[PDB]
Amino acid sequence: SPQRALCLLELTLEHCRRFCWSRHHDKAISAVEKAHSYLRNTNLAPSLQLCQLGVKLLQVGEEGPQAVAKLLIKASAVLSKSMEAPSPPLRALYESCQFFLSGLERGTKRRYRLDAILSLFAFLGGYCSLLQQLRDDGVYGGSSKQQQSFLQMYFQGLHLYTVVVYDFAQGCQIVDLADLTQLVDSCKSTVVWMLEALEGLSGQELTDHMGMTASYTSNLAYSFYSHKLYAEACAISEPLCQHLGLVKPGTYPEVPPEKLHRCFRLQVESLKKLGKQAQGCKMVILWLAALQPCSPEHMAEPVTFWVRVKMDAARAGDKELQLKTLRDSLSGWDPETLALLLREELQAYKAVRADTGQERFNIICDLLELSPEETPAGAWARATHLVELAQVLCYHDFTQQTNCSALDAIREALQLLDSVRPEAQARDQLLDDKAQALLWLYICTLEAKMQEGIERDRRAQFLYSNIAFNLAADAAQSKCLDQALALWKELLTKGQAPAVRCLQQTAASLQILAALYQLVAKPMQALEVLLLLRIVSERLKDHSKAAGSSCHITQLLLTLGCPSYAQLHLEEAASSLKHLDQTTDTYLLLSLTCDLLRSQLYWTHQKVTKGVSLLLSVLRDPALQKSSKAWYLLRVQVLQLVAAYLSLPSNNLSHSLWEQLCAQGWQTPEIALIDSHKLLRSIILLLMGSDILSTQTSFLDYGENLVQKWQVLSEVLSCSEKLVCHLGRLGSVSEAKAFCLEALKLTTKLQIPRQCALFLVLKGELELARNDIDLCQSDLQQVLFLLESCTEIPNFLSHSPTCDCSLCASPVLTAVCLRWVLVTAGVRLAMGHQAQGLDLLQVVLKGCPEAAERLTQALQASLNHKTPPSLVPSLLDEILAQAYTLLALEGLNQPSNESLQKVLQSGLKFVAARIPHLEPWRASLLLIWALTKLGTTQLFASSWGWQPPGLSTLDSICDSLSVAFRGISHCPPSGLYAHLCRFLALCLGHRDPYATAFLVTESVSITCRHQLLTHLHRQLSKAQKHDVPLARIQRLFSFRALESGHFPQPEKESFQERLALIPSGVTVCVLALATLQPGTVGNTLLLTRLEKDSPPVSVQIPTGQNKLHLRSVLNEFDAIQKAQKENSSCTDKREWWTGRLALDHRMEVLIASLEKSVLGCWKGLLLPSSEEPGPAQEASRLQELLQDCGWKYPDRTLLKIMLSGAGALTPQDIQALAYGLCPTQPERAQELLNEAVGRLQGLTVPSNSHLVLVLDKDLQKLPWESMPSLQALPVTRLPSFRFLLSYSIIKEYGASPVLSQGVDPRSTFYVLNPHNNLSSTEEQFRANFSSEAGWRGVVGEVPRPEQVQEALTKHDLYIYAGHGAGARFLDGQAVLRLSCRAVALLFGSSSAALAVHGNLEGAGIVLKYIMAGCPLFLGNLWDVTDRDIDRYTEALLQGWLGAGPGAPLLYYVNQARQAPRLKYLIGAAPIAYGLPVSLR
């Protein structure tokens, strides 16, 4: 019937509805069979039967794919048969809808095979054909609702296809190959049909349809993109975007920007990766065209894509694609829109971490041609583009192409900006633009100044340049930064968010400005800039930048000396880290930086154990070694913190943690500081080139480098300051001077007057340490000129305590002023002007607390905290401590002032409040307190057995000195350590023989110990980059290789360990001068005899009582040297020789005076001990009888040593010994001693015995070896007893061939008459030298440094017979870097002499030779004349080389002293350094 089919369809629909719950459609399937009987042929009926089978399957829900495939195949066949026939009934559509609903229920299974997908595709194609036929019918168009519903069903069908294809893609492994590879063809088909359908729809319907269609196409592309079949993913996605873009702008008004963004994003990504860039860029153009009628923030992403494809095309060698810009492709767009797109391309290009100079230059050129100048907005835009051009020409050379310098471009931009009258809305953008222009004006002027400095150095290859700083530029140039800061403060401090285009640029410019402020030594303005950066980062929600800014604030605050504010900002930094992805390098870097800052805070807050744990965790972290410049800077800061922890005394940390920290590779702070400087220099080489630091690449300005360049310059200046101060405090004035000079060169290159002044003041202090008043005063006057130049008897000491001037508002300038006053006071005190020096020191004392208060107020004003800093910042405390130390020493000079006496207690209280940060000054003040308590026989007499013929004061003095010693012993200053050690040795006496011997030994050559430790670190690092003996030597010379305990137990154990390593046959005698006033020369001689298997013997000889005292001997030696210099001026030969003979007689009397009136009977302590058993038995018997005579500290070893030289003990010596040791019954002791000597007559002195002389910086000058008793003994000098142990260690491993095998006489290199000045010397030695077998050398020419290096490293003997020691051919540093194998016979004036400048330890090239491992070094103590030294050289060479194999060099050194006519002026000059050496 007409409606029978409709009734059957409705019954089947109700049946399917029941089957959804009750499966009642089985009886209805029977009814459908009955209908097919009634209606024999009906396509709708067959479709209903197939849908009933599908409904049974959906009741099963999920089953074998075969059943679903069969049902879908039957449905497809029925649909094809129905559609092919002319029967487009709506009943077929109803049956198809029922089947689709059943499949949707089956869609909950979400399981379909490729065949199932294809069958669903065929069914959907048939349904789409039926729907198109229905839409063609006028019924669909007649009712808008009908067409809308038809469309709804049509898109619902392909939506199900989407869901199926999308799920199919997810549920697929890598094995799935052709599956999606084919599904993609039908995917293209669906996209084509969907696009075809969109035709005609208008209004809200159109907007929705493009939206949905874009949604599913994006879904399929997402999955297809994932499958890595980009080609397939493109094929599908092309036509949709082609339609979306080539339509007239505005046809699609409401289609969401991000929805289009997805489809285009997938294609461009696929287009980019597939390796064809061209139509990828064209797709970006089409992407921009599609979104052309919209806001630019969406266009931002398309722009980034353009740059990526173009950057990759430039990388891939393509240059044609590199050239094309958006102007060449987007012709027609309103200039405004085009200009905004060009601004976005420039910003995306700035984001790139590569070289993009011309790319940005091209964009700036197009932008400048595009903007009309005559209009005001055009002038403002031209100003901005000129700022961009200023940057590009500021770091690239395109001047020929543009015919304008960066300075001219930026000045024209500034002129254009200052004429802008802005709207009320665009006032903030003008503020930002002007700030950028001012900042880049400063940057370009600074770059021009740097290039001028580089060319100036390259031409004239510098105290004149220091005063050659133009002030006009200093004030005017710095004003640019102050004005930029004012503008940014105005922009950002307001509550409303800034209305600027790029707040990211504002943040980057703020980072650059902060870096510049820290370089120009203006740190408080850097703090302000960093606070603004945190406001910008919080607006941008960039937690990385907020955390970094807070970390920088914490670092700067700790540098300024405020721990509490730094703690607040450290917790602020920690909070921002929580908002960050933990797998990012940024997160790791900022977390490690935060841990470093907590470690530093714990160090400042005396929580040393926790801080050490944190620092160790940071050091052991594998991520610290990542190869990035930020990681390198973090390592620099880590090294500075390691130096900070190594400066703490031993009691602050347990032994285990000390070993754990030292095991990381650095034992002393200076080592860590030197490594930080080296790392900083390497970073500078990476960022820029060597030109900034040396004299002889391209700088990649990708934003990061910009800020890092200035940061590294600031950090290297700060590290240099730390290094100079630390080395100068130690006593290593030469290395400190070298670092100061390098830093001054850098600061003059950059034209920074504040840092120049700082390093000039440091240099002045260093020169004062050397007693060079002239050059110190020159440096100080330069400082005064620079201070008067920056400020707009000096005027800065007249300023009010609450002053707001340039000097008073800047902590750096205040520190420089106070340091200058300190150095001027020192100069005045060294010139004998006591009163003015004391007044200047009082000025420093008053000034430091006022400066601290001013900085406290300024910090609170900058940071806007309510509570004031808990304690005043601690940065001027070192200046105050040094002032206190100097005033206490001056009070030592004047014991009757009654105010300087109170100054000692004031200083002790001040320094005891700040334990352990001012420990060296505490030690100095404690030593001065001990000296005050001391101020004749003196209290030391009770502790010493020989007097020359707690509760007690001595106990309190010893306790104070022990506290000071443990305060400095880990990294001791040379002079203070020597004073403390010798004073403690005097106090301890024979109450602790081993502690006394340890203290005397520890007091000689400390600077050489520091230098050897640094050299060992360098050698270990060199070996590791490219060691067991080196580790042993480092442990031997270490300061921290001690067990835990109370003084002096661990030190005594370490000493006894060192005593066990003494070689047999070697006698070590340490002669030291006990000084009871710093800066003076004592008249007490400390002698220690160290032997193997013998207890150490120590004796004090007070020489102040005798008319011939030690100070007299030194003065006479210096007078003889001065007269020798004066006598050479004489032109009369006879008078010349008369003066020379008188000088020789004076020298002879001086040596006799040494032996007779300085040592006396104790001369035997230097002589060898017999192996015969007589002296031991004599001493054993004598010990008890002498204990009965009144010997307070009976020593069997001392008696045995003195009795071993009984053959020469005169009755005068015996009387002195007896009357000194036994003062109650002296004559009985004398009788016993005389009898003992009588029974000990006829002793043989041991033959194979050697003496090592360790002398003080003052006693080393004297010719000890030429004493009458030592003329028949083998004597050498060593810097220290640890050097003897190091020689033994080296000898065990066979690293000293000459000390192990001997000297090969045929391996010799000579340098004779190098300057062609000494003709008599050459004629005498030329033939003899040239005639020798295997002898090679340079005559008449200057040797090349390689020649001398090969002489020292490859030969066994090196003979220098010219002027001086040849420090010009090979300087000491070059000798240090070599391994010294040869025996250095340097016959020249003052070759083995050590230059004592002030209270500094002796310096000379002999020390470098010995630390390089020289077996023996022969040289002259003073200046000699050519002919007599020629006689000595000839005699020595003939005797040693003619003696035969196995001949000791020292024997013929001693024998050759008789050769010169002037026996005691020329023959006493040569001395030997090292160990005895023989021939092979």
- Closer Cβ to Zn ion, 448 or 809, answer by number: 809
Can residue 907 be called a binding residue for other proteins (CB under 8 A)?
A: no
Breaks (C-N over 2.5 A) in the chain follow: 461, 696, 792, 935, 949, 1026
Q: Rule CB under 8 A: is residue 584 a binding residue for other proteins?
A: no
Nearest C-alpha neighbor of 759 from the set 738, 773, 731: 738
**Applying CB under 8 A, does 751 fall inside the site for other proteins?**
no
Among 425, 582, 627, 656, binds other proteins (CB under 8 A): 627
Angstrom CA distances, 353 to 311, 454, 632, stand at 10, 27, 18
Which of the 8 DSSP states describes residue 1401? Answer: P
Return the residue of 443, 574, 1318, 1449 that touches other proteins, per CB under 8 A: 1318
Q: Which is nearer to other proteins, 24 or 678 (CB)?
A: 678
Question: Is the CB of residue 1432 less than 8 Å from the CB of residue 1467?
Answer: yes
**Closest to 549 measured CA to CA, from 565, 564, 570, 563:** 570
803 binds, among other proteins, Zn ion, none (CB under 5 to 8 A by kind): Zn ion
User: Quick check: 156 binds other proteins (CB under 8 A)?
Assistant: no
Chain contacts with Zn ion (rule: CB under 5 A)? 799, 803, 805, 808
Cα–Cα distance, 828 to 1103 (Å, whole number): 32
Q: Residue count at the site for other proteins (CB under 8 A)? A: 60
Residue 501: CB partners within 8 Å, gap ≥ 6? 343, 429
Given strand 1416-1420, what is the order of strands in its sheet?
A: 1097-1102, 1084-1090, 1066-1074, 1250-1254, 1275-1277, 1470-1474, 1416-1420, 1383-1386, 1357-1361, 1308-1312, 1335-1339
User: What token pair was written down for 744?
Assistant: 């001054």
| Binding flag, residue 1170, other proteins (CB under 8 A) | no
SS3 101: helix
Residue 1390 CB, nearest approach to other proteins (Å): 4
CB of 1240 to other proteins, least distance (A): 47
Contact yes or no for 1403/734 (Cβ under 8 A): yes
Of 448 and 685, nearer to other proteins (C-beta) is 685
1363 binds other proteins (CB under 8 A): yes
Position 489 contacts other proteins (CB under 8 A): no
CB of 1330 to other proteins, least distance (A): 22
Which pairing describes strands 1416-1420 and 1383-1386: parallel, antiparallel, or unpaired?
parallel
Cβ neighbours for 1315, distance < 8 A, ≥ 6 positions apart: 1342, 1362, 1363
The verdict on 1281 binding other proteins (CB under 8 A) reads: no
- Residue 1190, phi-psi category: left (phi > 0), alpha (psi -120 to 50), beta (remainder): left
Find the distance separating the first CA and the last CA of the chain, reported in whole Å.
Answer: 134
Measured CA to CA, the distance from residue 243 to residue 238 in angstroms comes to: 9
CB of 526 to other proteins, least distance (A): 25
Does 735 engage in binding with other proteins (CB under 8 A)? yes
What 860-868 contacts at long range (C-beta under 8 Å, 24+ apart), as own/partner pairs, is 862/524, 862/527, 862/528, 862/531, 863/527, 863/531, 863/565, 865/565, 865/568
Which is it for the CA torsion 152, 154, 157, 158, positive or negative? negative
What minimum distance in Å lies between the beta carbon of 314 and other proteins? 14
Q: Is 586 in the site for other proteins (CB under 8 A)?
A: no
Question: To the nearest whole angstrom, how small is the minimum distance from the Cβ of residue 806 to Zn ion?
Answer: 8
Q: How far is the CB of 1417 from other proteins (least distance, A)?
A: 15
Q: Rule CB under 8 A: which of 326-365 touch other proteins?
A: 353
Q: Are 165 and 187 in contact (CB under 8 A)?
A: yes
Candidate list 683, 815, 1299, 1407; residue touching other proteins; CB under 8 A = 683
Task: Report the nearest approach of other proteins to the CB of residue 734 (Å).
Answer: 5
* 573 and 590 Cβ atoms separated by less than 8 Å: yes
**Is 884 an interacting residue with respect to other proteins (CB under 8 A)?**
no
For other proteins, give the closer residue by CB, 4 or 458.
458
Query: Angle at which helices 230-246 and 257-273 pack, to 10 degrees?
Result: 140
According to the binding rule CB under 8 A, does residue 600 interact with other proteins?
no
Shortest Å, Cβ 1372 to other proteins: 7
Among 1428, 1436, 1456, 1465, binds other proteins (CB under 8 A): 1428
Angle between helices 25-38 and 4-19 (to 10 degrees): 160
Out of other proteins, Zn ion, none, which partner does residue 805 contact, by CB within 5 to 8 A per kind?
Zn ion
- Among residues 345, 877, 878, 1423, the one that binds other proteins under rule CB under 8 A: 1423
Interaction of residue 1409 with other proteins, rule CB under 8 A? no
User: Cα separation of 905 and 884, whole Å?
Assistant: 10
Q: Is the CB of 11 or the CB of 685 nearer to other proteins?
A: 685
Minimum Å gap between C-beta 828 and Zn ion is 23
> Quick one: 921 exposed, middle or buried, by C-beta within 10 A (0-12, 13-18, 19+)?
buried
Residue 682, contacted partner among other proteins, Zn ion, none, CB below 5-8 A by kind: other proteins
1434 binds other proteins (CB under 8 A): no
- Under the binding rule (CB under 8 A), the answer on residue 1241 touching other proteins is no
Instruction: Return the one option of Zn ion, other proteins, none that residue 1134 interacts with (CB less than 5 to 8 A, by type).
Output: other proteins
Query: Is the Cβ–Cβ distance between 1195 and 1228 less than 8 Å?
Result: no
Given a contact cutoff of 8 angstroms between Cβ atoms, the answer to whether 1240 and 1053 are in contact is no
Q: Estimate the crossing angle of helix 503-519 against helix 471-493, to 10 degrees.
A: 140
Is 432 a residue that touches other proteins (CB under 8 A)? no
Residue 1427 contact among Zn ion, other proteins, none, beta carbon within 5 to 8 Å by kind: other proteins
Q: How far is the CB of 397 from Zn ion (least distance, A)?
A: 44
Is position 219 an interface residue for other proteins (rule: CB under 8 A)?
yes
Which one-letter DSSP state was computed for residue 1244?
Answer: P
Q: Of other proteins, Zn ion, none, which one does residue 808 interact with (CB within 5 to 8 Å by kind)?
A: Zn ion
The residue to which tokens 């797709």 are assigned: 283
Q: Can you tell me which of 742, 1178, 1322, 1401 binds other proteins, judged by CB under 8 A?
A: 742
The interface partner of residue 799, options being Zn ion, other proteins, none and the CB cut-off 5 to 8 Å by kind, is Zn ion
Q: Which of residues 1091-1150 bind other proteins (CB under 8 A)?
A: 1128, 1131, 1133-1134, 1136-1137
Determine if 632 is a binding residue for other proteins (CB under 8 A).
yes
Segment interacting with other proteins (CB under 8 A) among 202-210, 321-329, 1055-1063, 1384-1392: 1384-1392
Query: Closest distance between Zn ion and the C-beta of residue 794, in Å?
Result: 11
DSSP code per residue over 938-958 = -GGGGG-S------SHHHHHH
By CB under 8 A, the residues from 694 to 733 that bind other proteins are 694
Any contact of residue 87 with other proteins (CB under 8 A)?
A: no
Residue among 1002 and 1423 whose Cβ is closer to other proteins: 1423
Choose from Zn ion, other proteins, none: what does 225 bind? Cβ within 5-8 Å by kind.
other proteins
Q: Which is nearer to Zn ion, 97 or 803 (CB)?
A: 803
Q: Which two tokens stand for residue 286?
A: 């089409």
Q: Which residues, 6+ apart, have CB-to-CB distance to 42 below 8 Å? A: 5, 35, 36
At its nearest, how many Å lie between other proteins and the CB of residue 308?
Answer: 9
Asked if residue 256 has a cis previous peptide bond (ω within 30° of 0), the answer is no
- Of 298, 1015, 1336, 1427, the one binding other proteins (CB under 8 A) is 1427
Residue ranges that bind other proteins, judged by CB under 8 A: 166, 218-219, 222, 225, 262, 265, 269, 353, 585, 627-629, 632, 678, 681-683, 685-686, 690, 694, 734-735, 737-739, 742, 1025, 1128, 1131, 1133-1134, 1136-1137, 1317-1318, 1320, 1362-1368, 1371-1373, 1388-1391, 1393, 1423-1429
